[PDB]
């Protein structure tokens, strides 16, 4: 069905050089909750977007990469300071992988009980990452859409593909809720969702943390649900 099982994780090829990783964590009350990130081969190296929930799961992502790609992981970028995105930082660091996050995510990480990334991204007024803070990002195009799911949430397009990654900002076109709103910015969410869409206008495959890949209707639907929060 395209879902490759490797240990307790699932890997799904999305494009020639792009795979989605999925890991699970029990939330007594919501069952075994999936979180998705990305793996991108860029020539002779690999780039990761988001950890798994835990170090052990994140080490399994690295093991899958060694088996299935067998190229060095040059860097990882993590998309905000929550456990699903940054819970496995130590595994990346033990593996010698350079890590990047929004400056604000690195500031938040220790209070969230998370390990900060080694490097901080900062963003221009137009939302786009300041390029000098994202060296060697290859095809990864990093965009801060504004506060939404969290204050620090960032998003990533993959050049050479039709894919844009909304992380925990974007939910699928049939979602019934915006999920965990504990740290959300209810006033700016809708605008932040639409800004993500406007940043990646040619992206036809929208990848997200807590749903399978969807069409751009994910963006419009998410923005319309968020319209209610104000």
- Closest contact distance (angstroms) between CB of 94 and Zn ion is 24
Would you count residue 171 as binding Zn ion (CB under 5 A)? no
Which of 150, 86, 144, 141 is closest to 118 using CA atoms?
Answer: 86
Would you count residue 185 as binding Zn ion (CB under 5 A)? no
Instruction: Report which secondary-structure segment, H or E, holds 146.
Output: none
Q: Which is nearer to Zn ion, 154 or 205 (CB)?
A: 154
Contact by Cβ (8 Å): 132, 108: no
Contact by Cβ (8 Å): 156, 79: yes
Contact by Cβ (8 Å): 141, 157: yes
Binding mask 86-125 for Zn ion (x = CB under 5 A): ----------------------------------------
For the chain, how many helices (H) and strands (E)? 6, 12
Helix, strand, coil shares of the chain as percentages rounded to 5?
25, 30, 45
Between residue 68 and residue 87, which ones bind Zn ion under the rule CB under 5 A?
Answer: 82, 84
Q: Which is nearer to Zn ion, 26 or 130 (CB)?
A: 26
Query: Residue 42 corresponds to which tokens in the numbers above?
Result: 């860029």
- Closest contact distance (angstroms) between CB of 131 and Zn ion is 26
Which of 154, 225, 163, 158 is closest to 195 using CA atoms?
Answer: 154
Considering only 115, 140, 168, 195, the residue that binds Zn ion (CB under 5 A) is: 168
Q: Which is nearer to Zn ion, 84 or 185 (CB)?
A: 84
Would you count residue 50 as binding Zn ion (CB under 5 A)? no
Would you count residue 42 as binding Zn ion (CB under 5 A)? no
Would you count residue 214 as binding Zn ion (CB under 5 A)? no
- Closest contact distance (angstroms) between CB of 99 and Zn ion is 17
> Which residues are at the interface with Zn ion (CB under 5 A)?
82, 84, 168, 209
């Amino acid at each position: 069905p395209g879902d490759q099982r490797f240990g307790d994780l699932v890997f799904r090829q999305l494009a020639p050089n792009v795979w989605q990783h999925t890991s699970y964590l029990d939330m007594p009350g919501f069952g075994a909750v999936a979180s998705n990130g990305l793996i991108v081969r860029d020539g002779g190296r690999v780039l990761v977007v988001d950890t798994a929930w835990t170090d052990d799961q994140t080490a399994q992502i690295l093991n899958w990469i060694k088996q299935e790609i067998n190229l060095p992981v040059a860097l990882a970028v993590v998309t905000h300071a929550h456990q699903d995105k940054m819970g496995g930082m130590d595994a990346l660091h033990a593996a010698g992988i350079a890590t990047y996050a929004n400056a604000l995510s690195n500031q938040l990480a220790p209070q969230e009980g998370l390990v900060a990334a080694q490097h901080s991204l900062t963003f221009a007024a137009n939302g786009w990452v300041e390029p000098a803070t994202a060296p060697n990002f290859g095809p990864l195009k990093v965009f801060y859409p504004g506060p939404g799911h969290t204050s620090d949430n960032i998003t990533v397009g993959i050049d050479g593909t039709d894919i844009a990654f909304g992380g925990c900002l974007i939910k699928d076109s049939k979602a019934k809720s915006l999920g965990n709103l504990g740290d959300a910015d209810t006033e700016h969410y809708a605008a932040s969702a639409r800004a993500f869409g406007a940043a990646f206008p040619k992206a036809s495959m929208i990848v997200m943390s807590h749903s399978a890949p969807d069409s751009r209707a994910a963006i419009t639907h998410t923005a319309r649900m968020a319209d209610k929060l104000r």
